[PDB]
Design an enzyme around this catalytic site. Structure first.
Site, mmCIF file in Angstrom:
data_model
loop_
_atom_site.group_PDB
_atom_site.id
_atom_site.type_symbol
_atom_site.label_atom_id
_atom_site.label_comp_id
_atom_site.label_asym_id
_atom_site.label_seq_id
_atom_site.Cartn_x
_atom_site.Cartn_y
_atom_site.Cartn_z
ATOM 1 N N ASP A 28 23.907 41.020 34.733
ATOM 2 C CA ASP A 28 24.492 39.756 34.286
ATOM 3 C C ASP A 28 23.514 38.904 33.479
ATOM 4 O OD1 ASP A 28 26.831 37.472 36.033
ATOM 5 O OD2 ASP A 28 26.502 37.919 33.930
ATOM 6 N N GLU A 54 26.391 44.510 31.425
ATOM 7 C CA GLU A 54 26.384 43.088 31.081
ATOM 8 C C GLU A 54 24.987 42.611 30.668
ATOM 9 O OE1 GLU A 54 28.992 41.078 33.581
ATOM 10 O OE2 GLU A 54 28.571 39.123 32.692
ATOM 11 N N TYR A 129 30.825 49.196 31.831
ATOM 12 C CA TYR A 129 31.068 47.853 32.263
ATOM 13 C C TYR A 129 32.542 47.748 31.908
ATOM 14 C CZ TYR A 129 31.191 42.843 32.174
ATOM 15 O OH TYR A 129 31.528 41.560 32.425
ATOM 16 N N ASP A 168 29.818 48.985 36.754
ATOM 17 C CA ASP A 168 30.747 47.962 37.229
ATOM 18 C C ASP A 168 32.139 48.305 36.714
ATOM 19 O OD1 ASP A 168 32.358 45.777 37.759
ATOM 20 O OD2 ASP A 168 31.037 44.281 36.857
ATOM 21 N N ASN A 170 34.917 46.801 37.865
ATOM 22 C CA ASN A 170 35.716 45.578 37.873
ATOM 23 C C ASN A 170 37.005 45.734 38.677
ATOM 24 O OD1 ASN A 170 34.446 43.359 36.838
ATOM 25 N ND2 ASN A 170 34.821 43.895 34.700
ATOM 26 N N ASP A 241 30.938 48.026 42.011
ATOM 27 C CA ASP A 241 30.008 48.939 41.362
ATOM 28 C C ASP A 241 30.024 50.256 42.119
ATOM 29 O OD1 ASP A 241 28.315 46.945 39.383
ATOM 30 O OD2 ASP A 241 28.918 45.912 41.220
ATOM 31 N N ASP A 266 24.288 38.334 40.030
ATOM 32 C CA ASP A 266 25.362 38.245 41.014
ATOM 33 C C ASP A 266 25.870 39.627 41.424
ATOM 34 O OD1 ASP A 266 26.332 38.533 38.430
ATOM 35 O OD2 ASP A 266 27.802 36.893 38.563
ATOM 36 N N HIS A 267 25.283 40.683 40.876
ATOM 37 C CA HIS A 267 25.478 42.040 41.337
ATOM 38 C C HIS A 267 24.181 42.527 41.953
ATOM 39 C CE1 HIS A 267 29.348 43.039 39.190
ATOM 40 N NE2 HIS A 267 29.002 41.903 38.608
#
Ligand SMILES: [Ca+2]
Length: 276
Positions: A28, A54, A129, A168, A170, A241, A266-267
């Site tokens: 991120d 990201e 991603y 990720d 999502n 993830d 935040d991951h």
DNA sequence: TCGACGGATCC
DNA sequence: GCTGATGCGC
DNA sequence: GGATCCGTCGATCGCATCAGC
């Protein structure tokens, strides 16, 4: 409740030792994440292959520290065609891959720098991603079209070489993959459309969810916590993830880890061990 | 994620 | 370089 | 009619760009 990753199992179901260590991390903000010393964590974890999502960082703004990273020298990067500071992925590898390629081969889905494909001797590594459905699901319709094109592409790939998909994706596949499933069935990443897409991805390629195949009833195992409301402090999170594996590769699966304590995003990162 | 909001609707 | 505002997120 | 129940619906954090100078 809260979660402790069990220890690293580095031998295969047949006792063969792990030969290949793949770390995947949605950073991120690649530059912010390096400023937050994530690269130190990467050095101590020492993967053979590092996949980042990201990055939010174009090729020529890549910080110098990445050159001075001598065990991950072959580095590949993809950024959106015309949206700066948005999305982005990288693939860093100790050994030089046979062939690297960008996108899934569909013009509509290859404009946001989301997919790197790296072909090795005995397997093919895809990192991705996945596009977020959006606040208020503004992009949920686009996302189902991605899901189908991605499914189709990966199926084609896996028909030629055993496939490792990481990054990720999502979506929290099932209710066990997020702390509050009842409140989020209309928020991005836990819509029925997204969880169905994931199910069809497993079914159609096919792929196995490596973590869940090893720990089929372990709750509270998440890879993401929103920055807000101290959500990581309380482990109010989502597992977004994954390492998804060709069934052919399950006898090579040694472990599939969630590095809950590594900070910088935040991951948190996820690490895969294979005997190949 | 969490909360303050509502407009419901129960005892 | 710096302010302030906007885009994007799970 | 005063407590609960449950669907919205804003505002939380963090990174990065952009407009302008
Ligand atoms: Ca937006």
């Amino acid at each position: 409740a809260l979660y402790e990753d069990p220890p690293d199992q580095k031998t295969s179901p047949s006792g063969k030792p792990a030969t290949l260590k793949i770390c995947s991390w949605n950073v991120d903000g690649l530059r912010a994440w390096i400023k937050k010393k994530g690269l130190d964590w990467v050095k101590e974890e020492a993967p053979d292959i590092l996949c980042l999502q990201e990055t939010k960082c174009s090729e020529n703004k890549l910080p110098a520290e990445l050159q001075e990273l001598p065990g991950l020298s072959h580095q590949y990067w993809s950024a959106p065609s015309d949206k700066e500071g948005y999305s982005g992925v990288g693939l860093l590898s100790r050994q030089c891959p046979l062939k690297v390629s960008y996108g899934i081969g569909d013009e509509e889905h290859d404009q946001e720098g989301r997919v790197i494909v790296a072909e090795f001797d005995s397997f093919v590594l895809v990192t991705a991603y996945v596009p977020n459905a959006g606040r208020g699901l503004v992009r949920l319709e686009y996302r189902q079209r991605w899901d189908e094109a991605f499914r189709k592409f990966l199926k084609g790939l896996a028909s030629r070489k055993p496939l490792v998909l990481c990054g990720d994706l999502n979506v929290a596949h099932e209710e066990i993959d997020l702390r509050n499933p009842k409140g989020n069935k209309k928020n991005a990443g836990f819509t029925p459309q997204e969880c169905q897409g994931f199910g069809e991805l497993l079914q159609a390629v096919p792929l196995a969810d490596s973590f869940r195949h090893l720990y089929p009833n372990t709750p509270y195992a998440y890879t993401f916590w929103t920055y807000m409301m101290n959500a990581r402090s309380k482990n109010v999170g989502w597992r977004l993830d994954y390492f998804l594996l060709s069934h052919s590769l399950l006898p090579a699966l040694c472990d599939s880890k969630i590095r809950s304590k590594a900070l910088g995003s935040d991951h948190c990162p996820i690490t895969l061990y294979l005997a190949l």
